[PDB]
Amino acid sequence: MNVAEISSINFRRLNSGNINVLKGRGVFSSRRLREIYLRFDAANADELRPGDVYVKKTKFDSMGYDSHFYNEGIGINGAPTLNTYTGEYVADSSSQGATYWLKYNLTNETSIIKVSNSARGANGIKIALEEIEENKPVVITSGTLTGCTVVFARKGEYFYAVHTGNSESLIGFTSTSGVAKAIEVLSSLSELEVPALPDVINNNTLVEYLSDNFDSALISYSSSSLKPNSMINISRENVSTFSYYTDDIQLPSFGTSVTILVRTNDNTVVRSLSESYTMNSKMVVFNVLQKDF
């Protein structure tokens, strides 16, 4: 079959709420910015801007990048850290490591939201599940994960996606400051008072926070025994955790973490998938976790 026929099959699978349309097919991201039908709340918390979390309620449009959702340090001349596009071109050359999604697509009836980390902190979105429209499925991608942390979570009729980390090669940041920024964004988006946290905030803190304040969550993250704050040593029944990097799996391997939101049979399906890709000739899936919300 040709690219168009396969891509329409892909759309019909996605539109039935089938997460496996994204299973094994590698990472995807794009810098492209086209307005999609869905409005969501967006928030940014960054060490360079101490104080209130920045919040955006208006739709993402094509009429200029909001600097809170942009990183001048990405690429040769900057790149958005939060953008929306439609699925006729799923991955572009900005997607480090992309494979299948450079060739095939999800058609222009799919709406894609890319959420990256902030230069020194977290970006997040909150989606009202009852606003996902029939035959207009939505995909959230976090791009190529090489040390950052991605949270997907549900509370009531709302879904949250938060990506925290840094682009500045900072020692120890993501498992401490990155967690604090993610908690600030999650709290702002969910209208919760930012908790009085311990002086030491790390990935275990993130598990505890999500468990106590969200119905269900998935954390996809990097950890290593040489970096204790990165290691998760507690467990909570409503928080799944996926260490896409470990003591063995590191760069040039990479993680992926995606969600589909699909209105079908009068209900919004929400399904997430995290993978770890590593060299076998070929990048292979080393580990995977699929969680429904």
What residue numbers does the annotated binding site for Mg(2+) cover? 148
Nearest distance from residue 122's CB to Mg ion, in Å?
10
Measure the N-to-C terminal CA separation of the chain; round to a whole number of Å. Answer: 34
| Feature table: binding site | 148
Kindly state the DSSP code that residue 200 receives in the 8-state scheme.
S
**Residue number, 15 or 144, with CB nearest to Mg ion:** 144
Nearest distance from residue 118's CB to Mg ion, in Å?
10
Q: How far is CA 35 from CA 8, 125, 198, 242, in A?
A: 21, 15, 40, 31
Report the alpha-carbon distance of residue 227 to residue 35 in Å, rounded: 40
Report the alpha-carbon distance of residue 273 to residue 260 in Å, rounded: 9
Nearest distance from residue 146's CB to Mg ion, in Å?
7
Cβ-proximal residue to Mg ion, closest one: 165
**Residue number, 169 or 281, with CB nearest to Mg ion:** 169
**Residue number, 7 or 253, with CB nearest to Mg ion:** 253
Q: Judge contact between 19 and 135, C-beta under 8 A.
A: no
SS3 of 95, please?
Answer: coil
**Residue number, 148 or 273, with CB nearest to Mg ion:** 148
* Tokens read off for 144: 């190529």
At residue 276, what is the residue type? Answer: S
Nearest distance from residue 117's CB to Mg ion, in Å?
6
**Residue number, 174 or 272, with CB nearest to Mg ion:** 174
Q: Which residues bind Mg ion (CB under 5 A)?
A: 147-148, 165, 174
Half-sphere exposure of residue 177, counting CA atoms within 13 Å on the CB side? 16
Nearest distance from residue 173's CB to Mg ion, in Å?
7
DSSP 213-282: HSSEEEEEEE--TTSGGG-----BTTEEEEEEE-SS--TTSEEEEEEEEEE-SSSEEEEEEEEEEEE---
**Residue number, 174 or 259, with CB nearest to Mg ion:** 174
Nearest distance from residue 168's CB to Mg ion, in Å?
9
The residues pairing with 80 across neighbouring beta strands, listed in sequence order, are 70
